[PDB]
Amino acid sequence: NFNGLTGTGVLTESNKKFLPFQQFGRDIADTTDAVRDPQTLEILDITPCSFGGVSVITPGTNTSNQVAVLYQGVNCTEVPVAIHADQLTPTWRVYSTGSNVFQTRAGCLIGAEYVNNSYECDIPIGAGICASYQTQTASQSIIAYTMSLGAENSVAYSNNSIAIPTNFTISVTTEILPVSMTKTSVDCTMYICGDSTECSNLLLQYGSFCTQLKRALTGIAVEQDKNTQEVFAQVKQIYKTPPIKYFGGFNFSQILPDPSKPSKRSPIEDLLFNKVTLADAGFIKQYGDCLGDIAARDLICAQKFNGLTVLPPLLTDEMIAQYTSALLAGTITSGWTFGA
Amino acid sequence: TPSALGKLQDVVNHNAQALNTLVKQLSSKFGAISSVLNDILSRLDPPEAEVQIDRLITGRLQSLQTYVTQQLIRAAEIRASANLAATKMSECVLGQSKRVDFCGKGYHLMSFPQSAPHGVVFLHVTYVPAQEKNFTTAPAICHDGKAHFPREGVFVSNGTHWFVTQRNFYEPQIITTDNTFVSGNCDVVIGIVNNTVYD
Amino acid sequence: ICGDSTECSNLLLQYGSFCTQLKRALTGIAVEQDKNTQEVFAQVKQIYKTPPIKYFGGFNFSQILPDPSKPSKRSPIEDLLFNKVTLADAGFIKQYGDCLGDIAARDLICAQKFNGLTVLPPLLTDEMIAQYTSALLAGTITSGWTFGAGPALQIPFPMQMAYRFNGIGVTQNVLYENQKLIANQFNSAIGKIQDSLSSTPSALGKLQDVVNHNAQALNTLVKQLSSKFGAISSVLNDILSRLDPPEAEVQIDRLITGRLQSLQTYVTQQLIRAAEIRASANLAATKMSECVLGQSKR
Amino acid sequence: LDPLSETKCTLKSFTVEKGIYQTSNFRVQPTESIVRFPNITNLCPFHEVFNATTFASVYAWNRKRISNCVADYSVIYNFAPFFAFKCYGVSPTKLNDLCF
Amino acid sequence: FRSSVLHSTHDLFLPFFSNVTWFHAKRFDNPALPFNDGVYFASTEKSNIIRGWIFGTTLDSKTQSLLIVNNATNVVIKVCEFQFCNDPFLD
């Protein structure tokens, strides 16, 4: 506190040449980084104290509670923590020693044992260094290592040698791509005011902010229905599969629709439908479902009471299954002819 | 493995999280004395309550515009995947595509679509060779003082005899006139070897 | 927003999760950029090593193969490309003494780090990307497109280049009779590439504008701290020392809303730029598999 | 207590998955002492303006230059109750902690 | 204090490439120059000729006037109702 200018910093006694009428110096952000002492005619710079981010590498809670600490952009050999009970309190937890310190180009990592072995990157840290909870150190702890780019291979290239395969392998891979999202609509006066009579009178004075946000949400809703339409409704003929016969030895029972269960979908689609759990399908919910029994994790009732509701999709799961079966029955009975 | 559909699971999780964090913004006090509008109207006078309500209106409007902005950005990401899935549907399921690594890894034979909640799953059937063997090859064959090149295969040698076979499969056959064609002499090819041709 | 102010950060918590929402958005971009680089260079799982340089039918790949004569194990072409683009901040560790003193230089990184603006280093370093490039390069020159669809099948490059002409519609005898001509035109074309990149510095303007827009976005974000959003001053310490806490809350609230709007504006532009980079990354990833790992008729 | 509980509070959940999953916090070094360095001086002639018999005219208002003194505004409070003590740029209780 | 920065300011400055008047007074009987929101005075003499200026509205005892005079050892600045003559000069 020189002349009413309070703050936090460290004096360095720089070599800035101030003029007799100049006492304070500011940076680009107009923050005073250099001041002239009121008593002595020396110049002192104001640099902020030790500052930096800290990340905590945590393995699975169901596995163990041992965690590692990473200080981003901080060198291990200058100030790891360097406090004694009367210093920083964002984190009241200090790891001092124990051969766990390691210097990376991303920062100082505390709580991991660096090994010369290379494995696949499990927990990305930065600068090509990753961590994992391995049980080969037997005790188990968090270790740091350099990520392995892959197995080393050398091709025996020659000017007169060639490799030709003698057999083959029919491999099937899976590729999942999102096609649509949840269509939601927001009530302006219900979310901002909430049935207040005095409110919603000053909100109309702001203009068309409610209408602009309404057209944007409805624009997304009609867009998601178009996205699903352009993917599954590429064909106009709903091809029905003939009675299951000997398709040359190929068994399509896992992908063809099975009438033994409702919704007319394959066992594979039955599994995929059970993996993803929809928070709100947008279907009708009874008014009595929210009244009482609020102890459950029914966050849908809380958002619907404030104007946040989810709209159901246009094409139901049954119609998408029929589009999938139509595309499936077409390619197995006609190849690529029905597409052109 | 339940972590196979993480892409589709993160979609419904981000939307649910965006709605949950939007409700918690109502409990925020954007510089006002309380987060409930009924309390401000009951405690302060209408002249003073307009100042407190205006802080809540601007605070909640900024929260809604932040939500709608992120939804418009996520909609562009979903549409990008939707246009990719629509193109992948026509090029992999409705036909056979020569694009490498597009319809799965390897030589794409055919694909089968599967319906999923807020997504689609493709079953790419690809051709993957295995257990290859090393052979001695030659660019051309010189029998009647003329260079013979393979029409659709490649010249190989098991050590003592030369044969012609396709690339993606080892099917050795005798070198004949119908499987090769003559073009030029034997002085232009570098690694051309001498071998008989059957007529 | 506060800058180590005790009175501040107490009214900021009353705004809700605005800090957490902007934090998840930035971390979402950070994990996204690591995925973009991963999907482009790590398309193969086997790190193929190039054999000792022999007569590749007359083709000279010395300009693209990694040269062990210089560190980082990259080709002379990559050496030139690495020198054209100048990174403002690579995200590596910077000593604390680097900012103390000698501030006369254009060290804007120290100014932004003092206000909470820091750059994180990428996951895959330049050395690992160079190894992925050499792996993709050594694979296509010794196995063609076979290593992309399955196991690496060795094949002579003149015979491999012959089937390249067979795909576009040219018989194999054309290459075998003009092998020396194709090799000379190939080597002359590669030498022309390094001369064009070294003479014309405006060739990498696309990659240069990326680091320039990010550096400018951070610089304009620091200048917003000097703005007076309806307050009497831009320094929070001055307002507390001049006005009483009852009156200072009105002035601080104007600065908080002003700086929050600046942060949300920065994060919004970063999300839009991230969509553009991801679109180019998905295009580069598709172009990697269709042009390098095979021959495309497009 | 420990970084695990800190990241639990950050994630607002009792279970944390594998990985960092968030940025825990930011390290900030606090102060250990105080350095008030204002200048060195003698008292202020506030008696020349407040303890005065007769002031000047309105059109001929006299301006008194004040410099090189320790302005202790607490000596003004013990005077007669003022009709209006209103500051338009600062608070009246903050003058003693500032320089001019 | 600012260093290695570009700062923009809006104040009364002298426009670049502006036509300025050069006086060689030598001749007396020169009327007083107007004060248009600020003046830029420059001279290169080395005989201590110019050592003061006057400022005012009418330059008489009817209104206030600023008298600035620079001596060899001190400077005197006074605000009083000076009755300036037609050609004021120091003796």
From Swiss-Prot, chain C:
The record marks R74, S75 as: Cleavage. Residues 94-114 are annotated as: Fusion peptide 2. Glycans are attached at N60. Residues 75-96 are annotated as: Fusion peptide 1. Residues 87-112 are annotated as: Disordered. Residues 179-229 are annotated as: Heptad repeat 1. Changing S241A: In strain: Alpha/B.1.1.7. Changing D209N: In strain: Delta/B.1.617.2, Mu/B.1.621. Disulfide bonds join C2-C8, C99-C110. Residues 208-252 form a coiled coil. Precursor of the fusion protein processed in the biosynthesis of the S protein and the formation of virus particle. Mediates fusion of the virion and cellular membranes by functioning as a class I viral fusion protein. Contains two viral fusion peptides that are unmasked after cleavage. The S2/S2' cleavage occurs during virus entry at the cell membrane by host TMPRSS2 or during endocytosis by host CSTL. This is Spike protein S2. It comes from Severe acute respiratory syndrome coronavirus 2 (2019-nCoV). The gene is S. The chain holds residues 742 to 1039 of 1273 of the full protein.
